Amino acid sequence: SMGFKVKLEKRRNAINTCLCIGLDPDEKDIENFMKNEKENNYNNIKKNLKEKYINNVSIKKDILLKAPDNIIREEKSEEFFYFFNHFCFYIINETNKYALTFKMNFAFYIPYGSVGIDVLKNVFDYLYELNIPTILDMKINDIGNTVKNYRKFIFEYLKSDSCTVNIYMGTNMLKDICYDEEKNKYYSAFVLVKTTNPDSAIFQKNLSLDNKQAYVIMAQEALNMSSYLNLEQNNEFIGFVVGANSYDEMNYIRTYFPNCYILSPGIGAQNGDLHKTLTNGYHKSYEKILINIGRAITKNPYPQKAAQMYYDQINAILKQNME
Amino acid sequence: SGLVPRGSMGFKVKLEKRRNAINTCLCIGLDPDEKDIENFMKNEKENNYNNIKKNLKEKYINNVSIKKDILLKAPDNIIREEKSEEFFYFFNHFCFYIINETNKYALTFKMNFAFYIPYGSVGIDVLKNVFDYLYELNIPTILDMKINDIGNTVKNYRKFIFEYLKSDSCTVNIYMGTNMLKDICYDEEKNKYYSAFVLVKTTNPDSAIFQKNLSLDNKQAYVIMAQEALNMSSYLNLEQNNEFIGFVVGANSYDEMNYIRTYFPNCYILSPGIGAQNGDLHKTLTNGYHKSYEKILINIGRAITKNPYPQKAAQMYYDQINAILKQNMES
Ligand SMILES: Nc1c(F)c(=O)[nH]c(=O)n1[C@@H]1O[C@H](COP(=O)(O)O)[C@@H](O)[C@H]1O
Ligand SMILES: Nc1c(F)c(=O)[nH]c(=O)n1[C@@H]1O[C@H](COP(=O)(O)O)[C@@H](O)[C@H]1O
Numbered sequence: 278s279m280g281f282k283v284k285l286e287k288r289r290n291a292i293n294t295c296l297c298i299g300l301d302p303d304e305k306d307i308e309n310f311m312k313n314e315k316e317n318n319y320n321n322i323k324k325n326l327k328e329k330y331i332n333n334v335s336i337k338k339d340i341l342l343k344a345p346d347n348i349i350r351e352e353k354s355e356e357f358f359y360f361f362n363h364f365c366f367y368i369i370n371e372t373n374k375y376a377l378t379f380k381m382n383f384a385f386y387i388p389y390g391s392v393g394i395d396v397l398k399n400v401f402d403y404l405y406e407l408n409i410p411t412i413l414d415m416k417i418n419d420i421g422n423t424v425k426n427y428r429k430f431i432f433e434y435l436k437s438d439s440c441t442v443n444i445y446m447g448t449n450m451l452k453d454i455c456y457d458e459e460k461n462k463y464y465s466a467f468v469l470v471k472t473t474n475p476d477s478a479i480f481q482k483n484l485s486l487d488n489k490q491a492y493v494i495m496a497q498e499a500l501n502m503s504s505y506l507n508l509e510q511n512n513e514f515i516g517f518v519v520g521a522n523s524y525d526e527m528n529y530i531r532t533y534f535p536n537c538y539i540l541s542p543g544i545g546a547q548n549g550d551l552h553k554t555l556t557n558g559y560h561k562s563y564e565k566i567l568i569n570i571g572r573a574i575t576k577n578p579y580p581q582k583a584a585q586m587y588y589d590q591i592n593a594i595l596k597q598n599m600e
Numbered sequence: 601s602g603l604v605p606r607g608s609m610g611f612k613v614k615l616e617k618r619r620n621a622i623n624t625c626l627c628i629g630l631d632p633d634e635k636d637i638e639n640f641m642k643n644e645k646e647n648n649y650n651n652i653k654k655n656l657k658e659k660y661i662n663n664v665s666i667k668k669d670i671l672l673k674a675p676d677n678i679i680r681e682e683k684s685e686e687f688f689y690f691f692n693h694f695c696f697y698i699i700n701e702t703n704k705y706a707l708t709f710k711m712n713f714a715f716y717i718p719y720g721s722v723g724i725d726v727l728k729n730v731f732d733y734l735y736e737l738n739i740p741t742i743l744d745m746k747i748n749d750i751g752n753t754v755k756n757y758r759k760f761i762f763e764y765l766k767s768d769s770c771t772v773n774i775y776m777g778t779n780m781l782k783d784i785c786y787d788e789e790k791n792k793y794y795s796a797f798v799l800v801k802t803t804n805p806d807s808a809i810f811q812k813n814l815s816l817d818n819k820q821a822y823v824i825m826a827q828e829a830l831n832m833s834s835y836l837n838l839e840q841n842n843e844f845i846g847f848v849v850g851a852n853s854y855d856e857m858n859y860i861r862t863y864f865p866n867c868y869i870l871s872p873g874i875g876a877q878n879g880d881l882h883k884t885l886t887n888g889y890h891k892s893y894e895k896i897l898i899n900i901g902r903a904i905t906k907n908p909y910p911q912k913a914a915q916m917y918y919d920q921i922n923a924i925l926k927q928n929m930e931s
Pocket of ligand 2: 419420423629631712744771799801802803804848850872873874875876877899900901902903
């Protein structure tokens with residue numbers, strides 16, 4: 278019942294970081310988990326089985342609760358489901374004490390068909406039980422009638438706190454993403470502003486209007502719609518995705534939108550500079566500058582230590598900025 | 601087989617061969633909503649499962665991948681013996697019904713992913729059986745998902761769309777950058793090439809705010825984006841491999857349709873917005889006209905799927921399109 282602004286602030290006060298852990302498991306990660314767990318006699322899956330909230334997931338709980346040794350031989354058709362889900366629970370278990378937010382990119386959960394969407398639901402239920410803020414990164418975009426399906430999937434089925442949105446088609450789509458008039462519900466989102474891909478300048482910087490580059494125009498229009506929807510008063514927000522390799526744009530966005538929520542991917546695997554990113558994007562309410570780190574944690578041999586490393590680096594920078 | 605392929609190689613070829621046989625550019629959209637599924641279940645109960653019994657006599661239902669056993673059951677037996685499969689069964693049967701009733705008028709079918717996800721996994725199973733079913737019927741397919749991400753991420757969508765569903769094409773939003781197309785329309789590790797349509801001008805009422813108002817070098821953003829897409833298609837050598845990158849241009853965007861067809865004469869256009877939305881068929885098809893009709897796909901979803909007589913609705917659009925194609929050929 279509390280809005281996302283309030284939930285995020287409360288979590289930030291409890292754990293004192295702005296680390297956002299990205300959970301994007303690829304086929305190799307799942308294969309590697311099954312191989313490593315076969316070698317270490319299922320050390321991590323055995324730990325997963327001891328956690329309280331595994332008893333609360335809603336999809337194929339009985340399969341997940343089985344011993345790894347029983348699955349491989351007598352439930353071959355559930356093997357991929359089992360190891361995929363257990364990899365996700367392992368990462369969450371190892372790293373959640375350091376996380377302000379988890380962000381799950383939908384692309385990683387769909388390419389096997391339905392099975393990965395069951396895993397995704399179980400992941401969102403598990404995070405909900407742990408009371409950890411969630412972002413579903415799906416970069417959704419469509420006309421209003423179609424996009425309402427994503428509002429349902431993301432905010433009703435998964436019970437996500439927030440999602441990502443590409444508003445290139447227009448900003449009117451957000452009326453059917455961030456607001457449900459019949460249910461009188463408000464939801465939060467981050468819109469794409471400046472992205473990490475190497476050619477991101479080709480439309481985001483080269484296109485312009487009124488002496489302002491497209492990324493600035495798009496950030497303004499997203500805030501105009503947030504204001505139209507009265508999201509702030511309802512404890513929700515529309516924020517911006519700004520790449521952690523995009524230092525000038527991060528500085529421009531925080532300078533011209535000093536109150537905005539920013540989500541910043543690109544540190545670690547994509548080699549963004551954490552110091553410049555967090556400094557340029559800084560806000561004393563530092564839930565407003567989420568630093569997403571995916572592969573540098575999930576592909577590290579010791580994800581707890583990887584998360585700790587980034588938690589420590591971030592906190593040192595926040596301390597410097599708090600002066 | 602290790603021998604040279606004998607079947608169609610490439611979406612361009614698949615589209616042209618079907619267009620030659622059925623003489624239309626109608627694209628039937630299959631976007632079933634919760635009400636559609638509800639209604640089908642209710643109507644079928646009331647007509648003693650007329651349409652599901654028809655579905656069960658079609659041969660290719662025997663070739664779908666997922667829970668075929670369940671789909672082949674008699675509907676009354678589903679209700680009493682497989683109650684937890686009821687929604688899956690009626691959702692998948694509504695789709696087969698629409699496909700059976702309308703496919704003979706369709707150059708291609710476009711399925712919008714959004715309608716298949718909001719129930720969790722169950723709808724993705726339906727989506728896969730739908731693509732399996734259309735594959736068997738050898739009807740060209742489009743998965744409309746407007747995908748976009750960085751390269752490492754988007755490869756997952758390439759896998760889902762082109763390897764798992766075996767779609768012929770998809771829709772893509774290239775606002776993040778054109779280079780994403782290298783990981784969608786091409787697979788370097790397999791030397792495979794796939795087709796896409798990129799968003800150029802969309803039907804939502806505020807579409808001008810970025811697509812028209814933003815500019816570079818005396819060109820509106822939609823022109824910039826179209827050109828970048830075409831440049832990437834050339835770089836990837838798609839057309840030499842019988843694939844293409846085309847454009848989504850809304851059926852209510854007449855000036856832009858004219859511009860696009862004029863300045864990109866041989867491009868593939870996909871145009872939604874007629875029927876349920878405010879598009880005008882005559883104006884759209886006239887501005888986007890190409891003698892290779894398959895380069896101007898006219899998508900109609902709700903005006904067919906929400907019609908109580910879908911075959912006749914499809915026939916009427918097919919007939920109208922053919923009359924307009926005739927006027928534009930010069931009878
Ligand atoms: N949402 C994104 C953007 F808008 C963007 O400009 N760049 C991104 O990387 N992501 C996502 O952020 C994550 C980066 O993960 P990691 O590199 O493993 O740390 C992936 O989910 C990406 O798809
Ligand atoms: N892909 C689209 C565009 F880029 C666009 O500008 N406008 C659209 O309507 N669609 C899709 O086209 C279909 C319109 O369906 P119908 O109105 O029922 O005939 C839906 O799937 C829409 O999401």
